[PDB]
A paper describes a structure:
We determined the 1.6 Å resolution crystal structure of a V. angustum [name] construct lacking the D domain but containing both R and C domains (denoted [name]-RC). The structures of the individual R and C domain are very similar to those of homologs such as NtrC1 (root mean square [rms] deviations of 1.3 Å and 1.7 Å, respectively), although the relative positioning of the R and C domains is unique. Rather than forming closed rings, V. angustum [name] monomers in the crystals form continuous helical arrays with six subunits per turn. In the V. angustum [name]-RC structure, the R domain is nestled between the two lobes of the C domain, forming a discrete interface with each. Interface I is dominated by an interaction between α-helix 5 (α5) of the R domain and α7 of the C domain. In interface II, α4 and β-strand 5 (β5) of the R domain interact with α13 of the C domain. The R and C domains are connected by a 20-residue linker (denoted R-C linker, residues 123–142). Strikingly, residues 137–142 of the R-C linker occupy a substantial portion of the C domain active site, sterically occluding the binding of the ATP substrate. The R-C linker is stabilized in the active site by an extensive network of H-bonds, including four with residues within the R domain and three with residues within the C domain. Gly 141 of the R-C linker appears to be especially important, as it not only makes three key H-bonds using its main chain nitrogen and oxygen atoms but also occupies a position deep within the active site that could not accommodate a larger residue.
Here, we use X-ray crystallography to study [name], the central quorum sensing regulator in Vibrio cholerae and related bacteria. [name] belongs to the subfamily of AAA+ ATPases known as bacterial enhancer-binding proteins (bEBPs). In [name], as in NtrC proteins, the phosphorylation of an aspartate located within the R-domain activates the C domain for ATP hydrolysis and the opening/activation of σ54-dependent promoters. Here, we present crystal structures and in vitro and in vivo functional studies of [name] that together reveal what is, to our knowledge, an entirely novel mechanism of AAA+ protein regulation, in which a regulatory segment of the protein prevents substrate ATP binding and hydrolysis by occupying a portion of the enzyme active site.
Numbering used by the authors: 3 to 123, 127 to 220, 224 to 388
């Protein structure tokens, strides 16, 4: 059983976060001081440390320093309030793997923990900027609460989940949430983006191929995903010929590797996503109607940023830390007039536009605080 050490001196928060992790079937140990965390580690090296920056006997940075003096590999995820993004960024620079903005929600914590444990000891590869909060999957606006509700109900079912929403609204992270809350959480999570692959290769990427299939026997997504979750992202980009083979695979669980006539089978739970209107794609003859009704079982609609109220403040704070790290700067807060302006703007490009705007600010300015004079058009 994997071990997570939670260094958290607020007992109610530690209990809440431990309850969030219940679906993952882990051994979670709570300590409330740096002394007790370091004592634990002398005996048992955990598979992950969740480390609050604020502790009664020493700072979280001091814990991190003392851990890294003897343990260079154990993953550390920092838990921080808005007010300590400056310290969270310095913690990453010193040797921590990611930071989580508090308060945290159940799905975001499960995704972060599951990704940190699988990265160490096989799912689709992941890095820091792939973290849930940077993709917009953070906050407790009513529209997001509706998403979390469906994830919780659906995760335990094998029924296919069909995710819609504009580009950059959190659809891929929503699929990771389903996986982490499901009984398949410890099995592979495989995401294939159907737009990211050329058409002459996507059948091979999905179903594998044998040696000399086209100008050695490689394993496709369906095989990598066996007993786990297969996510088909940007699914409406798939061509009609491949759609017919996908429908056959969904119905029968059977497939052929490219270049082979041999029949193979796997057991996957399906999630898919599109930023198109899927029924419109059916009406226009671009998407098979039978495939639509086969897949459109448990629908989830991600709300755009303009419908999510105060969530934008949380995402912006996460991204300010991420862009400071990426661009070698030390921004850690926004002025209140900047935040008011971010709340009034409708973000037509959703999280990608938010990332762009914050990156532009961080590249062009050197400050600890984002001020109104830094905000580009068309925001102001």
């Amino acid at each position: 059983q994997r071990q997570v050490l939670m260094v958290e001196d607020t007992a109610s928060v530690a209990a809440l976060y431990k309850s969030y992790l219940n679906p993952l079937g882990l051994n979670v140990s709570i300590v409330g001081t740096g002394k007790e965390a370091l004592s634990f580690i002398q005996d048992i090296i955990p598979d992950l440390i969740l480390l609050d920056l604020r502790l009664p006997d020493m700072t979280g940075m001091e814990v991190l320093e003392r851990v890294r003096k003897e343990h260079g590999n154990v993953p550390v995820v920092i838990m921080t309030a808005h007010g300590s993004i400056d310290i969270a960024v310095e913690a990453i620079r010193y040797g921590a793997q990611d930071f989580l903005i508090k308060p945290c929600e159940a799905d975001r914590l499960r995704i972060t923990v599951n990704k940190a444990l699988k990265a160490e000891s096989t799912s689709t590869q992941s890095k820091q900027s792939d973290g849930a909060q940077y993709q917009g999957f953070i906050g407790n606006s009513l529209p997001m609460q509706a998403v979390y509700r469906v994830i919780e109900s659906a995760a335990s079912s094998k029924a296919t989940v069909f995710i819609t929403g504009e580009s950059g609204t959190g659809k891929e992270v929503c699929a990771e949430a389903i996986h982490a809350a499901s009984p398949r959480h410890d099995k592979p999570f495989i995401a294939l983006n159907c737009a990211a692959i050329p058409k002459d290769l996507i059948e091979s990427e999905l179903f594998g191929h044998v040696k000399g299939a086209f100008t050695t026997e490689r394993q496709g997504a369906v095989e990598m995903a066996h007993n786990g979750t297969l996510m088909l992202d940007e699914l409406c980009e798939m061509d009609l010929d491949l759609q017919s083979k996908l429908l056959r695979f969904i119905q029968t669980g059977t497939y052929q590797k490219v270049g082979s006539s041999k029949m193979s089978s796997v057991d996957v739970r399906f999630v898919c996503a599109t930023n198109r209107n899927p029924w419109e794609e059916v009406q226009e003859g671009r998407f098979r109607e039978d495939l639509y009704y086969r897949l459109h079982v448990i629908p989830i609609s991600l709300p755009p940023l303009r419908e999510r109220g105060g969530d934008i403040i949380e995402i912006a704070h996460a991204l300010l830390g991420l862009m400071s790290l990426e661009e070698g700067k030390s921004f850690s807060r926004f002025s209140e007039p900047v935040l008011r302006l971010f709340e009034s703007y409708s973000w037509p490009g959703n999280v990608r536009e938010l990332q762009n705007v914050i990156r532009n600010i961080v590249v062009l300015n050197t400050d600890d605080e984002v001020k109104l004079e830094m905000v580009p058009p068309p925001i102001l």
